[PDB]
Design a protein around this ligand. Structure first.
Ligand SMILES: CC(C)(COP(=O)(O)OP(=O)(O)OC[C@H]1O[C@@H](n2cnc3c(N)ncnc32)[C@H](O)[C@@H]1OP(=O)(O)O)[C@@H](O)C(=O)NCCC(=O)NCCS
Length: 172
């Protein structure tokens, strides 16, 4: 069904189209982002993926040839922790139970290296869709970082969540 393949610039025009406004970019990728999404805005992230070993891995979720989502992994190899980030489905792919398959695939990649013992993520407290999806995928809420992210005149709270390898294995 859904496949995760390495992200490539060849997929950038598809990805760029999923964000209509600055706010949608910020929700996805944080307060540094500006609309339209541009390759220049992704340079630091992509360079992280060219380090050896790689600090970030970027992924495109595809169905056959069609790019329908994006996700990232950030590696803390000293501690054996990976952070999930920048998870999005194309707007036309939302509401079709593709959220969970994408998370399950991403988790598989995160735990592929046997030295990873923990996976984690941040989610804005108001991002109810994302938060429920993460819980369904087996993530436990671990805390709430108050007034952490500045966006305009607002400050957003960040829910922290985590999943241990033995929990991930127990669930599947
Ligand atoms: C987060 C995202 C990947 C989820 O996609 P999806 O799985 O199709 O999400 P949906 O819109 O179907 O909602 C998913 C689930 O949450 C539940 N849910 C709870 N509150 C919800 C809300 N406000 N809207 C939609 N679903 C909600 C749904 O019922 C569904 O679960 P169920 O089958 O158990 O009922 C998608 O919304 C997205 O790409 N959003 C924009 C980017 C973003 O916010 N990224 C996350 C942080 S980077």
């Amino acid at each position: 069904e859904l496949q995760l393949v390495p992200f490539q610039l060849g997929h950038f025009p598809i990805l760029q189209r999923w964000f209509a406004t600055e706010k949608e970019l910020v929700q996805w990728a944080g307060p540094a982002l500006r609309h339209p999404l541009s390759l220049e805005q992704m340079h630091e992230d992509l360079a992280e993926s060219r380090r050896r070993p790689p600090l970030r891995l970027l992924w495109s979720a595809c169905r056959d040839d069609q790019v329908i989502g994006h996700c990232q992994l950030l590696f803390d190899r000293r501690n054996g922790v990976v952070r999930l980030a920048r998870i999005v489905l194309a707007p036309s792919a939302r509401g079709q139970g593709l959220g969970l398959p994408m998370l399950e695939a991403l988790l598989a990649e995160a735990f592929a290296d046997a030295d990873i013992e923990r996976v984690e993520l941040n989610v804005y407290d108001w991002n109810a869709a994302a938060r429920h999806l993460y819980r369904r995928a087996g993530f436990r809420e671990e805390g709430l970082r108050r007034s952490a992210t500045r966006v305009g005149r607002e400050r957003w709270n960040v829910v922290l969540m985590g999943l241990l390898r033995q929990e991930w294995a127990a669930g599947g």
